[PDB]
Amino acid sequence: DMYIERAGDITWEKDAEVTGNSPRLDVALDESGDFSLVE
Amino acid sequence: TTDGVYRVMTRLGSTQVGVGVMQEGVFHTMWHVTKGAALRSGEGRLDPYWGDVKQDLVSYCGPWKLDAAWDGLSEVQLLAVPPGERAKNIQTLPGIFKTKDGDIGAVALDYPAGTSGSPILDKSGRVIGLYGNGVVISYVSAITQGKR
């Protein structure tokens, strides 16, 4: 069985770690909700 | 029922299958996390109210409440709730999924699968979408938002 447990407030944190790129990707979304790359 | 971010757990032992957002009395997560199953919250039960496989979203106890959207320019924060770790904020500039139907923000962050449903926040603290439906190029998640 599936259950939920509170883990925190929804808040922005001023001291957050910062990481990751910002790629621009062409994609398609199919009926099953799956994204795939397009060329 | 308290507003906040929550782990979605299953049971021999317990495993974290995802995350979701309680806001305005409604629980929001990704369809692939729960497959629409009812959820326990203490002694109470949360039943699904709306869901859509193509958007990969589901709401419990009422209609989808989250409506903010990425502004297309600003950094955002993934409020990641990884299995076995405290909730933590990861700031990033989204990239973009370009589709035939318009552009969707995307975050190039690769967290454990049990992190799916974690909210992505704008600078005001509003939830602009949920993490965990995406593509591999590294994994890149759409910023998936529903309709209020």
Residue numbers in the entry:
A (entry chain A): 50 to 88
B (entry chain B): 18 to 28, 31 to 156, 160 to 170
Excerpt from the publication:
Here, we present two crystallographic fragment screening campaigns using a 96 fragment sub-selection of the European Fragment Screening Library (EFSL) provided by EU-OPENSCREEN.
For the second fragment screening campaign LigandFit and PanDDA were used to identify binding events. Out of the 22 binding events 10 fragments are binding in the S1 subpocket of the active site close to the catalytic triad forming π–π stacking interaction with Tyr161. For expansion of the fragment hits seven representative hits close by or at the active site were selected. Whereas the second binder, based on fragment hit EOS102818, EOS90861 keeps the initial binding mode exactly with an RMSD of 0.37 Å between the MCS of fragment hit and follow-up binder. Compound EOS90861 forms a new H-bond with Asp129D and interacts as well via π–π stacking with Tyr130B.
